[PDB]
Structures are given as C-alpha cells and as structure tokens.
Coordinates of C-alpha atoms and ligand atoms in Angstrom, one line a residue:
Chain A
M1 CA -119.8 9.4 -4.4
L2 CA -122.9 7.9 -6.2
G3 CA -124.0 6.0 -3.2
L4 CA -125.4 3.0 -5.2
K5 CA -126.9 0.3 -3.0
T6 CA -127.1 -2.6 -5.6
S7 CA -125.7 -6.1 -5.0
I8 CA -123.8 -6.8 -8.3
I9 CA -124.8 -4.4 -11.1
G10 CA -123.2 -1.1 -10.3
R11 CA -120.6 -2.3 -7.8
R12 CA -118.3 -0.3 -10.1
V13 CA -119.1 2.3 -12.7
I14 CA -116.8 3.7 -15.4
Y15 CA -117.9 6.9 -16.8
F16 CA -116.7 8.5 -20.1
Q17 CA -117.3 12.0 -21.4
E18 CA -117.0 10.2 -24.8
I19 CA -116.2 6.7 -26.1
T20 CA -116.3 4.8 -29.3
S21 CA -118.6 2.1 -28.0
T22 CA -119.5 1.1 -24.4
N23 CA -120.1 -2.4 -25.6
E24 CA -116.6 -2.7 -27.3
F25 CA -114.9 -1.3 -24.2
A26 CA -116.8 -3.7 -21.9
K27 CA -115.9 -6.7 -24.1
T28 CA -112.3 -5.8 -24.5
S29 CA -111.3 -4.7 -21.0
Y30 CA -110.7 -6.9 -18.0
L31 CA -113.6 -5.9 -15.8
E32 CA -115.4 -7.5 -12.9
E33 CA -119.0 -8.7 -13.0
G34 CA -121.5 -5.9 -12.3
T35 CA -119.2 -3.2 -13.8
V36 CA -121.2 -0.6 -15.7
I37 CA -119.7 1.3 -18.6
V38 CA -121.5 4.6 -19.3
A39 CA -120.7 7.5 -21.6
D40 CA -122.2 10.9 -22.4
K41 CA -121.9 9.9 -26.0
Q42 CA -120.7 7.1 -28.3
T43 CA -118.9 8.0 -31.5
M44 CA -119.2 4.5 -33.0
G45 CA -122.1 2.7 -31.5
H46 CA -124.0 -0.1 -33.4
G47 CA -127.2 -2.0 -33.0
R48 CA -128.1 -5.7 -32.8
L49 CA -128.1 -5.9 -36.6
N50 CA -124.7 -4.3 -36.5
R51 CA -126.2 -1.1 -37.9
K52 CA -125.3 2.5 -36.9
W53 CA -126.9 3.6 -33.6
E54 CA -127.0 7.4 -32.9
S55 CA -125.7 8.1 -29.4
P56 CA -125.6 11.9 -29.0
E57 CA -125.4 13.7 -25.6
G58 CA -128.6 13.6 -23.6
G59 CA -129.2 9.9 -23.9
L60 CA -128.3 7.0 -21.6
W61 CA -125.6 4.8 -23.3
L62 CA -124.3 2.0 -21.1
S63 CA -123.1 -1.6 -21.0
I64 CA -123.0 -4.1 -18.2
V65 CA -120.4 -6.8 -17.7
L66 CA -122.1 -10.1 -16.6
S67 CA -121.0 -13.6 -16.0
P68 CA -124.1 -15.6 -15.2
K69 CA -123.6 -19.2 -14.2
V70 CA -126.8 -20.5 -15.6
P71 CA -127.6 -23.3 -18.1
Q72 CA -126.6 -22.3 -21.7
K73 CA -130.3 -22.7 -22.5
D74 CA -131.2 -19.6 -20.5
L75 CA -128.4 -17.5 -21.9
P76 CA -130.6 -16.1 -24.7
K77 CA -132.8 -14.4 -22.0
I78 CA -130.2 -11.9 -21.0
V79 CA -131.5 -9.5 -23.6
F80 CA -135.0 -9.6 -21.9
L81 CA -133.5 -8.5 -18.6
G82 CA -132.3 -5.3 -20.4
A83 CA -135.6 -4.7 -22.1
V84 CA -137.7 -5.3 -19.0
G85 CA -135.4 -3.2 -16.9
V86 CA -136.0 -0.3 -19.3
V87 CA -139.7 -0.8 -19.3
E88 CA -139.9 -0.7 -15.5
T89 CA -137.8 2.5 -15.4
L90 CA -140.1 4.0 -18.0
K91 CA -143.2 3.1 -16.0
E92 CA -141.6 4.8 -13.0
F93 CA -141.4 8.0 -15.1
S94 CA -145.0 7.3 -16.3
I95 CA -144.1 6.4 -19.8
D96 CA -145.7 3.4 -21.4
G97 CA -142.8 1.4 -22.9
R98 CA -143.7 -1.8 -24.7
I99 CA -141.3 -4.5 -25.9
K100 CA -140.9 -5.3 -29.5
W101 CA -139.4 -8.8 -29.7
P102 CA -136.8 -9.5 -28.9
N103 CA -134.7 -6.4 -28.0
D104 CA -136.6 -3.1 -28.5
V105 CA -138.7 -0.9 -26.3
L106 CA -141.3 1.3 -28.1
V107 CA -143.7 4.0 -27.0
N108 CA -146.6 4.3 -29.4
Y109 CA -144.6 2.1 -31.9
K110 CA -141.7 4.6 -31.8
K111 CA -138.3 3.2 -30.7
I112 CA -137.2 4.7 -27.4
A113 CA -134.5 2.1 -26.5
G114 CA -132.5 -0.8 -27.9
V115 CA -130.7 -3.7 -26.2
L116 CA -127.7 -5.5 -27.5
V117 CA -126.2 -8.6 -25.9
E118 CA -122.7 -9.8 -26.9
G119 CA -120.6 -12.5 -25.3
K120 CA -117.5 -14.6 -26.0
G121 CA -117.5 -17.5 -23.6
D122 CA -118.1 -16.7 -19.9
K123 CA -118.2 -12.9 -20.3
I124 CA -121.6 -11.5 -21.4
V125 CA -122.0 -7.8 -22.1
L126 CA -125.5 -6.3 -21.8
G127 CA -125.7 -3.1 -23.9
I128 CA -128.5 -0.6 -23.5
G129 CA -129.2 2.6 -25.4
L130 CA -132.1 4.7 -24.1
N131 CA -133.2 8.0 -25.6
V132 CA -133.7 10.5 -22.8
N133 CA -133.1 14.2 -23.7
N134 CA -131.1 13.6 -26.9
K135 CA -132.3 14.3 -30.5
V136 CA -133.4 11.1 -32.2
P137 CA -133.7 9.8 -35.8
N138 CA -137.1 9.9 -37.5
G139 CA -139.5 7.3 -36.1
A140 CA -137.8 7.0 -32.8
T141 CA -138.7 8.9 -29.7
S142 CA -137.3 9.9 -26.3
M143 CA -138.4 10.3 -22.7
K144 CA -138.1 14.1 -23.1
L145 CA -140.3 14.1 -26.2
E146 CA -142.8 11.9 -24.4
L147 CA -143.0 13.8 -21.2
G148 CA -142.7 17.2 -23.0
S149 CA -139.9 18.1 -20.6
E150 CA -136.3 17.3 -19.7
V151 CA -135.6 14.3 -17.5
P152 CA -132.7 14.2 -15.0
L153 CA -130.3 11.8 -16.8
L154 CA -128.8 10.7 -13.5
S155 CA -132.2 9.8 -12.0
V156 CA -132.9 7.6 -15.0
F157 CA -129.5 6.0 -14.6
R158 CA -130.1 5.3 -10.8
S159 CA -133.6 3.9 -11.6
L160 CA -132.4 1.6 -14.3
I161 CA -129.4 0.2 -12.5
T162 CA -131.6 -0.6 -9.5
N163 CA -134.1 -2.4 -11.7
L164 CA -131.4 -4.3 -13.6
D165 CA -129.7 -5.5 -10.4
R166 CA -133.0 -6.8 -9.0
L167 CA -133.9 -8.6 -12.2
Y168 CA -130.4 -10.0 -12.6
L169 CA -130.2 -11.5 -9.1
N170 CA -133.6 -13.1 -9.4
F171 CA -132.7 -14.4 -12.8
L172 CA -129.6 -16.2 -11.4
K173 CA -132.0 -18.0 -9.0
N174 CA -135.1 -18.2 -11.1
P175 CA -134.2 -18.0 -14.9
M176 CA -137.8 -18.5 -16.0
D177 CA -139.3 -15.6 -14.0
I178 CA -138.2 -13.1 -16.6
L179 CA -140.4 -14.7 -19.3
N180 CA -143.5 -13.7 -17.5
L181 CA -142.4 -10.1 -17.1
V182 CA -141.6 -10.0 -20.9
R183 CA -145.0 -11.5 -21.7
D184 CA -146.8 -8.8 -19.8
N185 CA -144.9 -6.0 -21.4
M186 CA -144.5 -7.2 -25.0
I187 CA -146.4 -6.1 -28.0
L188 CA -148.6 -9.1 -28.9
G189 CA -151.8 -10.0 -30.7
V190 CA -150.9 -7.9 -33.9
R191 CA -149.6 -8.8 -37.3
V192 CA -145.8 -8.9 -37.9
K193 CA -143.4 -9.8 -40.7
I194 CA -140.4 -12.0 -40.0
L195 CA -137.3 -11.0 -42.0
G196 CA -134.7 -13.7 -41.9
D197 CA -133.7 -16.0 -44.8
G198 CA -136.6 -14.8 -46.8
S199 CA -139.7 -13.8 -44.8
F200 CA -143.2 -14.7 -43.6
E201 CA -146.1 -13.0 -41.9
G202 CA -148.6 -13.9 -39.1
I203 CA -149.9 -13.1 -35.6
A204 CA -147.3 -12.7 -32.9
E205 CA -149.1 -14.8 -30.3
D206 CA -146.6 -15.0 -27.4
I207 CA -143.1 -16.2 -26.5
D208 CA -142.5 -19.8 -25.4
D209 CA -140.6 -21.2 -22.5
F210 CA -137.4 -20.5 -24.4
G211 CA -138.2 -16.9 -25.2
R212 CA -138.9 -17.9 -28.9
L213 CA -141.6 -15.7 -30.6
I214 CA -144.7 -17.7 -31.5
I215 CA -146.2 -16.6 -34.9
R216 CA -149.4 -18.0 -36.3
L217 CA -149.4 -17.8 -40.1
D218 CA -152.7 -17.3 -41.9
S219 CA -152.6 -21.0 -43.0
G220 CA -152.8 -21.9 -39.4
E221 CA -149.2 -22.9 -39.4
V222 CA -147.2 -22.1 -36.2
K223 CA -143.6 -21.1 -36.4
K224 CA -141.2 -20.5 -33.5
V225 CA -138.7 -17.6 -34.1
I226 CA -135.4 -18.0 -32.4
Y227 CA -133.6 -14.7 -31.8
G228 CA -130.4 -14.2 -33.8
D229 CA -130.2 -12.8 -37.2
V230 CA -133.9 -12.1 -37.8
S231 CA -135.8 -8.8 -38.0
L232 CA -139.4 -8.2 -37.0
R233 CA -141.6 -5.6 -38.8
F234 CA -145.0 -4.6 -37.7
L235 CA -147.6 -4.4 -40.4
Chain B
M1 CA -124.5 10.3 -17.9
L2 CA -122.7 12.8 -15.6
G3 CA -122.1 15.2 -18.4
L4 CA -118.8 16.6 -17.0
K5 CA -117.5 19.5 -19.1
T6 CA -113.9 19.5 -17.9
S7 CA -110.9 19.3 -20.3
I8 CA -108.6 16.9 -18.5
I9 CA -109.6 16.0 -15.0
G10 CA -112.8 14.1 -15.2
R11 CA -112.5 12.9 -18.8
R12 CA -113.1 9.5 -17.2
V13 CA -114.4 8.6 -13.7
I14 CA -114.2 5.2 -12.1
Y15 CA -116.6 4.8 -9.2
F16 CA -116.6 2.0 -6.5
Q17 CA -119.2 1.3 -3.9
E18 CA -116.2 0.1 -1.8
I19 CA -112.4 0.1 -2.2
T20 CA -109.3 -0.4 -0.1
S21 CA -107.7 2.8 -1.3
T22 CA -108.3 5.1 -4.3
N23 CA -104.7 6.1 -4.4
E24 CA -103.5 2.5 -4.4
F25 CA -105.9 1.5 -7.2
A26 CA -104.8 4.7 -9.1
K27 CA -101.1 3.8 -8.6
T28 CA -101.3 0.2 -9.8
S29 CA -103.8 0.6 -12.7
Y30 CA -103.0 1.9 -16.2
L31 CA -105.2 5.0 -16.5
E32 CA -105.2 7.9 -18.9
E33 CA -104.3 11.3 -17.5
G34 CA -107.3 13.1 -15.8
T35 CA -108.9 9.8 -14.7
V36 CA -110.7 10.2 -11.4
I37 CA -111.0 7.3 -9.0
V38 CA -113.8 7.7 -6.4
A39 CA -115.5 5.5 -3.9
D40 CA -118.3 5.7 -1.3
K41 CA -115.8 4.5 1.2
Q42 CA -112.3 3.3 1.7
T43 CA -111.6 0.3 3.9
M44 CA -107.9 1.2 4.1
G45 CA -107.5 4.9 3.6
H46 CA -104.3 6.6 4.8
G47 CA -102.9 10.0 5.2
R48 CA -100.1 12.3 4.3
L49 CA -98.3 11.3 7.5
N50 CA -99.3 7.7 7.2
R51 CA -102.0 7.9 9.7
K52 CA -105.0 5.7 9.0
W53 CA -107.5 8.1 7.3
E54 CA -111.2 7.5 8.2
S55 CA -113.2 7.2 5.0
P56 CA -116.8 6.4 5.9
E57 CA -119.9 6.7 3.7
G58 CA -120.9 10.3 3.2
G59 CA -117.5 11.6 2.4
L60 CA -115.7 12.5 -0.8
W61 CA -112.8 10.1 -1.3
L62 CA -111.0 10.3 -4.6
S63 CA -107.7 10.2 -6.5
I64 CA -106.7 11.9 -9.7
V65 CA -104.2 10.6 -12.2
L66 CA -101.8 13.2 -13.6
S67 CA -98.6 13.2 -15.6
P68 CA -97.7 16.9 -15.6
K69 CA -95.3 17.8 -18.4
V70 CA -93.5 20.4 -16.3
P71 CA -89.9 20.9 -15.0
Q72 CA -88.9 18.5 -12.1
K73 CA -88.8 21.3 -9.5
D74 CA -92.5 22.0 -10.0
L75 CA -93.7 18.4 -9.5
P76 CA -93.9 18.9 -5.7
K77 CA -96.6 21.7 -6.0
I78 CA -99.3 19.2 -7.1
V79 CA -100.4 18.8 -3.5
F80 CA -101.3 22.6 -3.4
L81 CA -103.6 22.2 -6.4
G82 CA -105.6 19.8 -4.4
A83 CA -105.6 22.0 -1.3
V84 CA -106.6 25.1 -3.2
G85 CA -109.3 23.2 -5.2
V86 CA -110.9 22.1 -1.9
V87 CA -110.7 25.7 -0.6
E88 CA -112.5 27.1 -3.7
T89 CA -115.2 24.4 -3.5
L90 CA -115.7 25.1 0.2
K91 CA -116.1 28.8 -0.5
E92 CA -118.7 28.0 -3.2
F93 CA -120.7 26.3 -0.4
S94 CA -120.3 29.3 2.0
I95 CA -117.5 27.7 4.0
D96 CA -114.2 29.4 4.7
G97 CA -111.5 26.7 4.7
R98 CA -107.9 27.7 5.4
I99 CA -104.8 25.7 4.4
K100 CA -102.6 24.1 7.0
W101 CA -99.4 23.8 5.2
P102 CA -98.8 21.7 3.3
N103 CA -101.7 19.4 2.6
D104 CA -104.7 20.0 4.9
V105 CA -107.7 22.3 4.9
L106 CA -109.2 23.5 8.2
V107 CA -112.3 25.4 9.1
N108 CA -111.9 27.3 12.4
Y109 CA -108.9 25.1 13.0
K110 CA -110.8 21.9 12.6
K111 CA -109.7 19.5 9.9
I112 CA -112.2 19.1 7.0
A113 CA -109.9 17.8 4.3
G114 CA -106.6 16.0 3.6
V115 CA -104.5 15.9 0.5
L116 CA -102.1 13.1 -0.3
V117 CA -99.8 13.0 -3.3
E118 CA -98.0 9.8 -4.5
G119 CA -96.0 9.4 -7.7
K120 CA -95.7 5.8 -9.0
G121 CA -93.5 5.8 -12.1
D122 CA -93.9 8.9 -14.2
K123 CA -97.5 9.4 -13.3
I124 CA -98.6 11.4 -10.3
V125 CA -101.6 10.5 -8.1
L126 CA -103.4 13.3 -6.4
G127 CA -105.4 11.9 -3.4
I128 CA -108.1 14.0 -1.7
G129 CA -110.3 13.2 1.3
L130 CA -113.0 15.7 2.1
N131 CA -115.5 15.3 4.9
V132 CA -119.0 16.1 3.6
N133 CA -121.8 14.2 5.3
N134 CA -119.8 11.5 7.0
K135 CA -119.1 11.1 10.7
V136 CA -115.7 12.5 11.6
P137 CA -113.2 11.9 14.4
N138 CA -113.4 14.2 17.4
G139 CA -111.7 17.5 16.7
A140 CA -112.4 17.3 13.0
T141 CA -115.4 18.8 11.0
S142 CA -117.4 18.3 7.8
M143 CA -119.4 20.4 5.4
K144 CA -122.5 19.0 7.0
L145 CA -121.4 20.0 10.5
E146 CA -120.4 23.4 9.3
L147 CA -123.6 24.0 7.4
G148 CA -125.9 22.1 9.7
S149 CA -127.5 20.1 6.9
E150 CA -126.8 17.3 4.5
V151 CA -124.9 18.4 1.4
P152 CA -125.6 16.9 -2.0
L153 CA -122.4 14.8 -2.3
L154 CA -122.5 14.7 -6.1
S155 CA -122.7 18.5 -6.1
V156 CA -119.5 18.7 -4.2
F157 CA -117.8 16.3 -6.5
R158 CA -118.9 18.3 -9.6
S159 CA -117.6 21.5 -8.0
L160 CA -114.3 20.1 -6.9
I161 CA -113.5 18.5 -10.3
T162 CA -114.3 21.7 -12.1
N163 CA -112.0 23.7 -9.9
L164 CA -109.2 21.2 -10.0
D165 CA -109.4 20.9 -13.8
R166 CA -109.1 24.7 -14.1
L167 CA -106.3 24.9 -11.6
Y168 CA -104.4 22.1 -13.3
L169 CA -104.7 23.5 -16.8
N170 CA -103.3 26.8 -15.6
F171 CA -100.5 25.0 -13.7
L172 CA -99.4 23.4 -16.9
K173 CA -98.9 26.8 -18.4
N174 CA -98.0 29.0 -15.3
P175 CA -96.8 26.6 -12.6
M176 CA -95.9 29.5 -10.3
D177 CA -99.4 30.9 -9.9
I178 CA -100.5 28.2 -7.4
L179 CA -98.0 29.4 -4.8
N180 CA -99.8 32.8 -4.7
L181 CA -103.2 31.1 -4.2
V182 CA -101.8 29.0 -1.4
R183 CA -100.2 32.0 0.3
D184 CA -103.5 33.9 0.3
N185 CA -105.4 30.9 1.7
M186 CA -102.8 29.5 4.2
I187 CA -102.6 30.0 7.9
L188 CA -99.7 32.4 8.4
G189 CA -98.3 34.7 11.1
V190 CA -98.8 32.2 13.9
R191 CA -96.5 30.1 16.0
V192 CA -95.8 26.5 15.0
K193 CA -93.7 23.6 16.1
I194 CA -91.9 21.2 13.7
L195 CA -91.9 17.7 15.2
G196 CA -89.2 15.0 14.8
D197 CA -85.5 15.2 15.2
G198 CA -84.0 18.7 15.5
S199 CA -87.5 19.7 16.5
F200 CA -88.0 23.5 16.7
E201 CA -90.6 26.2 16.8
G202 CA -91.2 29.7 15.5
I203 CA -93.4 31.9 13.4
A204 CA -94.8 30.6 10.1
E205 CA -94.0 33.6 8.1
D206 CA -94.7 32.5 4.5
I207 CA -93.9 29.9 1.9
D208 CA -91.1 30.5 -0.7
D209 CA -90.7 29.9 -4.4
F210 CA -90.4 26.1 -3.7
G211 CA -93.4 26.1 -1.4
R212 CA -91.2 25.6 1.6
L213 CA -92.6 26.9 4.9
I214 CA -90.4 29.8 6.1
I215 CA -90.2 29.8 9.9
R216 CA -88.5 32.5 12.0
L217 CA -87.2 31.1 15.3
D218 CA -87.0 33.3 18.3
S219 CA -83.2 33.6 17.9
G220 CA -83.9 35.2 14.6
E221 CA -82.6 32.2 12.7
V222 CA -84.6 31.4 9.6
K223 CA -85.4 27.8 8.6
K224 CA -87.1 26.5 5.5
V225 CA -89.2 23.4 5.9
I226 CA -89.5 21.0 3.0
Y227 CA -93.0 19.5 2.6
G228 CA -92.1 15.8 2.7
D229 CA -92.7 13.8 5.9
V230 CA -93.0 17.0 7.9
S231 CA -95.2 16.9 11.0
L232 CA -96.4 20.3 12.1
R233 CA -98.3 21.6 15.1
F234 CA -100.0 25.0 15.9
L235 CA -99.0 26.4 19.3
Ligands
ATP301 N1 -131.0 6.8 -30.9 C1 -131.8 5.9 -31.6 N2 -133.0 5.7 -31.2 C2 -133.8 4.9 -31.9 N3 -133.5 4.2 -33.0 C3 -132.3 4.4 -33.5 C4 -131.3 5.3 -32.8 N4 -130.1 5.3 -33.5 C5 -130.3 4.5 -34.5 N5 -131.6 3.9 -34.6 C6 -132.2 3.0 -35.5 O1 -132.2 1.8 -34.8 C7 -131.4 0.7 -35.4 C8 -130.7 0.1 -34.2 O2 -130.0 -1.1 -34.4 P1 -130.6 -2.4 -35.1 O3 -131.0 -2.1 -36.5 O4 -129.7 -3.5 -35.1 O5 -132.0 -2.6 -34.2 P2 -133.1 -3.8 -34.5 O6 -134.1 -3.7 -33.5 O7 -132.5 -5.2 -34.5 O8 -133.7 -3.3 -36.0 P3 -134.8 -2.2 -36.3 O9 -134.2 -0.8 -36.2 O10 -135.2 -2.4 -37.7 O11 -136.0 -2.3 -35.3 C9 -130.6 1.4 -36.5 O12 -130.5 0.5 -37.6 C10 -131.4 2.7 -36.8 O13 -132.3 2.6 -37.9
ATP302 N1 -111.9 11.9 7.5 C1 -111.1 12.6 8.3 N2 -111.4 13.9 8.7 C2 -110.6 14.5 9.5 N3 -109.5 14.1 10.2 C3 -109.3 12.8 9.9 C4 -110.0 12.0 9.0 N4 -109.4 10.7 8.9 C5 -108.4 10.7 9.7 N5 -108.2 12.0 10.3 C6 -107.2 12.4 11.3 O1 -106.5 13.6 10.8 C7 -105.1 13.4 11.0 C8 -104.3 14.3 10.0 O2 -103.7 13.8 8.7 P1 -102.5 12.7 8.5 O3 -103.0 11.3 8.9 O4 -102.2 12.7 7.1 O5 -101.2 13.2 9.5 P2 -101.1 14.2 10.7 O6 -99.7 14.2 11.2 O7 -102.0 14.0 11.8 O8 -101.4 15.7 9.9 P3 -101.7 17.1 10.7 O9 -100.5 17.7 11.3 O10 -102.3 17.9 9.6 O11 -102.8 16.8 11.8 C9 -104.9 11.9 11.0 O12 -103.6 11.5 11.7 C10 -106.1 11.4 11.8 O13 -106.0 11.4 13.2

C-alpha cells in the first residue's frame, strides 16, 4: 500500500511498532536484498563504536539488507551511501546536513544522524538513525528542531529510500562516484583530532580514492585514516 | 515510521511492491500474531470461491495472521471480522457498504471488497481485498468510483487496521458480538439462490448463532447454509 517505485532498496519493507535493534534483526533474519527494516523505536540500538544510541518514537530508525557484488576494496564505501543519502534527503527539506567522516551527518556541528554498517560475508546491513521529531541527547539535533516544526516521518522515509536506491544502483555500476558526492558534502578544511591507538591532530584535507581521511599534521606529515575503530573529534 | 497504535493487529507489517499472494506468504511464513502482510499488487490473487481475484495497483491487498485462543466453534466467525472491519472503514469514508453473506461487501449491490480466510496449522490467515483506486472488473466498484476521486491508500490501510484490531480484541473476549454487527450490516429480507447440488432458493431471513444463513423456501421449509464453499446469488 506504500506504492514504492524503487528498483532494489524498498522492494520489501518490514515495519515494527517496536524492536530491539533493526540492525540485529536484519543481520539475523533470512531477508532478500533491498529489504528495509524500520521501527517506530528501538529499545537496544547501538552506534558504530558499539555505544548506546537513543531511538525514541519520532525518529527514523531503519536498516537495509544489501549484497553488493563489488570488489572487496569498495566495500568500505557502503557507509558513505548512507551518509550521502541522508544529506540529500535533508537538502530536500532545506536542512544543511554535512558529513563528519566517516559515518555522521551534522547540522551546525550537531549530530542529526548516524550510519552503521555491519556485514558477515556476503550480507551487508546498512543501518541509519535519523532524528526527525524525536527528543535528542545534548549536542545532537533533529529535523524538527532545525525547521522549528514537525516533519511528516513517512515523507522523510519515502525521500530517503528513493535517494538510497538511486545511489546504490549507481554504486554497483560506478563504485567511485560516491566519493565525489561525499567530498562535496563533507566537513573539511578544519582541525580535527584522531582518536585510535593514542591520537594525533591536524587538518582534515580530504578523502582519498579509498575513502580514507587525509590529515595534515602541523609537522607537515600526512596520515591516511582508514575507517574502523577510530574516533574523530573537531577542535 | 508508520506509528501504528494498535494492540495486536499491526504490531508488525510486511510490505511488498509485488507478491504472488499475501495469504500464501502468510500461510507459509513463521509470523507472530497480528502481523500484517500487504502488497501494492498480487500476481496470483484468488477468492473465497477460488476465482482469480484481480489485485492491480491502487487497491488494498492484505492478509493478517491470527491465532485466536477461542473455542473451536467460534473459529469460523473470523471472516465476519474482516467483513465488518471493511464496512466500518467504508462508513468512515462516507460509503455505505453492505455485507453479502458470508464474505463480501457491496455498495449498491456492486462488489467493493472480498474476504478470504484460510487456516494453515493452528494459525488463521485473514485475507482482505478492497478496491480503492484500482481499476475493477465490470459490475464491481471501488472507493474511488463511489467517491469520484482518488483516495489516500495509506489512509484506508490505517483505518481498516484500527477497526480490525478493535474488533479482534473484543472477539477474543466476547466472540458472539460480531454476529450482531454482521446482522445489522448484512443484506437480508431478499430472495437468494444457493448454487451447486441440491440447489434451492428462498428468502435470506437472518444468520443464526453459528453464522449460518437461514433461508425460508417457498414451501415453508427452513434450511441453514454453512459458510464453506457456498456459492450464492441474489434474485
Ligand atoms: N539520537 C541520537 N542522536 C544523536 N546522537 C546520539 C543519539 N543517541 C545517541 N547519540 C550519541 O551518538 C553516539 C552514537 O554512536 P557512536 O558513538 O558509535 O557514534 P560515532 O560517530 O562513531 O562517535 P561520536 O558520537 O563520538 O561522534 C553515542 O555514543 C551517543 O553519544
Ligand atoms: N478486485 C476485485 N473487485 C471486485 N470483484 C472482483 C475483484 N477481483 C475479482 N472479482 C470478481 O468477484 C468475484 C467474487 O468473489 P469470489 O471469486 O471469491 O467467488 P464468487 O462465487 O464469484 O463470490 P460472489 O457470490 O460473492 O460473487 C470473483 O469470482 C471475480 O469475478
């Protein structure tokens, strides 16, 4: 009854009034590629760092089952598809979402959405949490808070699914195209701190042909940050 | 993201852009009670009397999984919950649908909805096909045709699910109530013919405590028709 017109993402949609985690359900269940898992609220959702993620009613909490048949070298770019998809949807609603490498979207440096990719073998789950009309923790923001008014959750869902489906299909054909889109919507040219095994600071210059974040340390040294267990902090 | 507030029916909804049959998927898949299977269109929909049911885009095609903890005798009345739910929804949209015993809803004698109940194992599958904005076979009708304008399909879904959830919760406690609702919304006091072997005709007087159609033949003989494979015609 939704009348979705997408090619792969959204061929099927499983909606829950409530769920522990859409990502966990997507990973565990036998589901066909393109299947979207969405819930009014998650009781046990986590972030990329495996930290607690608030998923109250009013927000958009979903996961997409994907099985891309692309080189293993491009696989780390799936997170970007999610982030760019959100940015585009936000632009449609006249909200200036900007990407914080590698998985966050911020509005005025306030977190409005987070993306989490998980995948054992051939099955890849693209998780997305977007604050729409829900209350948010300090520092974060939402579409409602930004526009000063409620936003039809379903409209945001329809918009996002449409963008993700387009970005995904093109990605299967042109895996590099996403990098340009990320580049144009990513927070760059400012100082950041990299928190991994220890830490270092520098200018976030750009992302390379592998999606790695390029940081220029004050000594002139250039480091390439591969996304995994690493945290980025703006100074 | 749908924000359904129902208690059982609609706790989970599985949507398909295309499917062979919602009832079939609902019969063969392990699904928790109250799960709703819905699709933009069915490629192999079928009816109460095994006639191919046309399910083009624009219509409301769904199946609901139930496992009513009620006495055996009551199990057969599930079809009426569907019929009445449709009638209540139609009324909300300013349409007067009347029940053609035992599973169809008509508007000015034109078929607008069909209910099909199947029970694989101990779970019951309530199938409902409602013509909203889709093209319909000659002689049939739709909410669009009745109202003269497109009808927000999701709005009809939300309304029907709300009514069915309420009707089902009461049925679990007071399984006899549904009969009264059917009586008050069914086509009675008119001549009908029961097709098949032993075919006969008479006046459709009422339905009894088992939901059997009570027919008075001209001889004065009274026959009670079970709602199984029965094929009925208005004269
Ligand atoms: N609804 C929400 N909106 C925005 N931020 C949230 C929300 N719920 C939780 N958070 C914060 O976002 C984090 C989400 O997961 P995670 O920490 O893994 O993200 P990250 O981008 O890798 O790290 P960071 O939060 O430091 O940017 C939580 O640790 C929490 O501090
Ligand atoms: N979407 C639809 N809207 C209206 N009528 C339909 C639709 N799809 C199929 N039909 C027709 O409606 C008929 C009625 O339902 P069914 O197939 O379950 O058996 P039936 O014996 O014809 O029932 P009835 O006595 O109520 O007409 C079908 O036989 C078919 O000709």
